[PDB]
Ligand binder design. Sequence first.
Ligand SMILES: Nc1nccc(-c2c(-c3ccc(F)cc3)ncn2C2CCNCC2)n1
Lengths: 352, 18
Amino acid sequence: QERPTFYRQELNKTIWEVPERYQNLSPVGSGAYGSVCAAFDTKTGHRVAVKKLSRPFQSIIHAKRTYRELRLLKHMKHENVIGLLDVFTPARSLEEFNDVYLVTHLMGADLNNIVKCQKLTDDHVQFLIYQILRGLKYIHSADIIHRDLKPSNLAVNEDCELKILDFGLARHTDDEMTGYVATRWYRAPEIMLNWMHYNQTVDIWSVGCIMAELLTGRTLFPGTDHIDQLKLILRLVGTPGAELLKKISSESARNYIQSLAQMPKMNFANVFIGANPLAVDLLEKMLVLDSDKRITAAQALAHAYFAQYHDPDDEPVADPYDQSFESRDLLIDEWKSLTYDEVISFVPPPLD
Amino acid sequence: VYPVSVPYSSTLSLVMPS
Ligand SMILES: Nc1nccc(-c2c(-c3ccc(F)cc3)ncn2C2CCNCC2)n1
C-alpha cells in the first residue's frame, strides 16, 4: 500500500526509525557495515532480523558498497541464502534519504556459536554441509563467488536449517570489524596473497575447512601468519610440485617451506579419528591444492555422504547476476541515487 | 590427529546459545 506509520527509539546509540509492523527490537550484534536487531513482524507473524546500515553514504567506497549489497540481496532467492523480506528507509524523497534498513527471516545463531557450545553428530554435519553446498550451487550458477565462507557467515536456527550471507570482496584488508583474522583460516591457498589467479573453486576449499571443524570442533588451519598458514596446510595435503607451489605462495613463504623437509600427504582417515568414512572421503576431495581436481558444489551434492537429503529436482539454480556496475566510478550522490531506485522498486514475497 | 566430537557408528536440532 502507501507509506507505513514509523516509530523511533534508540538502539546501539543511534536512532532506529522503523515501520510499526516491527516490534520488540533487540540488538543481536553487528553485521557487515551495520548492526542487526531481532524483531517481531505483525504483518507476517514471523520473527525477523533488521539490519541498519551505518552511515551508508559517508564516502564513495561506502556508497558503492551499499548499492552492491542491496542489488545482491534483492537478487538472492533461495532457501539457503539470505534474501529480503523487506527493505525500507524513513525518507519520503531522495533529498532526505540517508538511512537504509534491510529485513530477513530471524536466524538464531551462526556456526561459530554452535561449534563453541556443543558437539555435533555426523547427522548434524551431513545436513549442515548439504545445505551449504546446495546454496553454493545456486550462488555459483549465477557467476558469483562468495570468497569468505566461514562459520560466522553461516546462520542457523534450532531446526538445523542454514543460510549463507555476507559475500566478500576480492580484496585483502586488516580494517576494523572486517573479520580478517578468521577469514585467513578458511581461505584457499591460491588467494592467500593476491587475487590474480583464481575461480569459484576457492569456496569449496572453504567448505572443506568448515566441514572438518564441524566434525572435530576445532579450527583446522588456525595459522598466525601467511607462512605459518601455508605450513599447516601442506603438513596435511603434502608438499606439492614446484610449479604449483609457486602459484600458491610468496617468495619468502616458498623459501621457508623449502628450508623444511618435504612433507608427505597424510591419510585423512588417521587424522579424523572416529569419522564417518564417507565424511573423510568427501573431505579428501575438497581439500586439495589443485583447484581443478577439487570436487564442485554440483558434484558434491550427489556424494553418498548426503544420500539421505540429496534430490536433484529440489536443488535449484539461479538467474545469472549482472555485476557490470562494478566498473563505474561515481559520486556519493550518484550511488546513493541508484540505491534509492532500488529501494523504491522493491517487491516483497507473497504472504503464504 | 583430530578426534571427532561424536564417533560415527553404523529430526535434527541445534541449541541456540542464549
Ligand atoms: N539474527 C540474524 N538473523 C539473520 C541475519 C542476521 C545477520 C544479518 C542480517 C543481514 C541481512 C538482513 F537483512 C538482516 C540481518 N547480517 C549479519 N547477520 C548475522 C549473521 C552471522 N551472525 C552475526 C551477524 N542476523
